[PDB]
């Protein structure tokens, strides 16, 4: 979109950082996975660590996906299933209001994306994708605007 | 503005001929014939790509007129 | 778990460029089919992880495909067996 | 009970006037958001009835918001930091 929050950009910019960094060609899924847990706090990156999936848990298994090297980082954009990612991140805010996309729906979005890269990492570290998506969700209250709500006046207003 | 690329509509053209060349060629096989065919295919792809925003320096240049005359040209063109 | 993979690439030159960087010890087959080139990979002597791990670097370039193997192995059609990934990085790098 | 709320303010004069007789050993932060501006206070050393206490006063000035706090602590806007009333005082009573 070109219209996203930071927080997802970030987690999507930490991918490329994994990408050379575990050697990749291309910025595959896991690295997006790892950019969730590794911006620390964030409705995903606390999501993930919820569920008991810390930066520890996820890179060894990551590792164990694609080992180092690959360091050239070959044409580095996105693998098409990491490039999915973006765009369900996108969807996955559209869907719950966010028109500035934030971590939290690029987290949904892997569990969307479910045979990616990201997805086997989860589904190898014992903590089941749907467990993940729900814990973004269950983060991801998004308050009102628009109105306010604070307390309950009136009475004879409420049936006219 | 934007009536073509920058005039690199060819381009597109180019691409379809080589994939042609590239598909048939492999699906024969012109192994190494298919070989450089490839490589011209992806490689044309992506320069095609690369020029098809080239005429995004068209947008930066254009895409705003709404003008007088402009307008003028669509009140005359309904009617 | 599973020990044998099908792999779509959009283009023939996604594969090619993939080829270039995994051939595997695991003989593999490359159709054409809709003018999108499919790749069915097909480990022999890898264990389940050792396959979703190498299958990772595949699909790079590649997505995978919902496709059934016995759909392609009566009506594909073949560009490369055996060691399609190896062959392809011959007869496509130049 | 907790020991941090999130409290909303309809305008910058209401700010003052929670500042003006509450700090409460409680470090708290302002942000602006739809022109409203909410206050976090965080009580640090403090029992829960100690805070229900000073929470009825801090609700004179204020109103008790629905704002869940990592909402807030992403998708808000800071005015001031942790010792948000004491700098209010300075910041809004002069």
């Known amino acids: 979109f070109g219209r996203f929050t930071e927080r997802a950009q970030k987690v999507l910019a930490l991918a490329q950082e994994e990408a050379l960094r575990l050697g990749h060609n291309n910025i595959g899924t896991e690295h997006i996975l790892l950019g969730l847990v590794r911006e620390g706090e964030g409705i995903a990156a606390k999501a993930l660590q919820a569920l008991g999936l810390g930066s520890e848990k996820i890179q060894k298994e990551v590792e164990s996906l694609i080992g180092r090297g690959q360091e050239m980082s070959q044409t580095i954009h996105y693998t098409p299933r990491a490039k999915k990612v973006i765009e369900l991140s996108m969807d996955e805010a559209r869907k719950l209001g966010h028109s500035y996309v934030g971590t939290e729906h690029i987290l949904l979005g892997l569990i969307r994306e479910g045979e990616g890269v990201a997805a086997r990492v989860l589904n190898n570290l014992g903590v089941s994708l749907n467990k993940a998506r729900q814990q973004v969700l269950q983060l991801l209250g998004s308050n009102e605007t628009g109105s306010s709500a604070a307390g309950t006046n009136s009475n004879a207003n409420t049936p006219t | ?79 | 778990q599973k020990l044998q993979f099908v792999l779509r690439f959009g283009d023939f030159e996604d594969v090619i460029s993939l080829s270039k960087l995994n051939v595997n010890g695991s003989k593999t087959t490359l159709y054409s089919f809709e003018n999108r080139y499919y790749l069915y990979v097909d480990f022999c002597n890898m264990t389940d992880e050792e396959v979703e791990n190498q299958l990772s670097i595949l699909l790079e370039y590649a997505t995978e495909s919902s496709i059934s193997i016995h759909r392609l192995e009566e009506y594909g059609k073949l560009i490369i067996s055996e060691h399609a990934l190896e062959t392809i990085k011959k007869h496509f790098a130049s």
């Open chain 2, 1 to 79: 503005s934007f009536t073509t690329p920058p005039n690199l509509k060819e381009l597109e053209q180019k691409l379809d001929e080589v994939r042609k060349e590239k598909d048939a060629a492999v699906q024969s096989q012109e192994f190494e014939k298919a070989a450089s065919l490839r490589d011209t295919e992806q490689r044309l792809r992506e320069q095609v790509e690369d020029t098809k925003k080239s005429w995004k320096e068209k947008q930066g240049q254009e895409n705003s007129e709404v003008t007088v005359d402009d307008i003028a040209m669509v009140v005359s063109s309904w009617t």
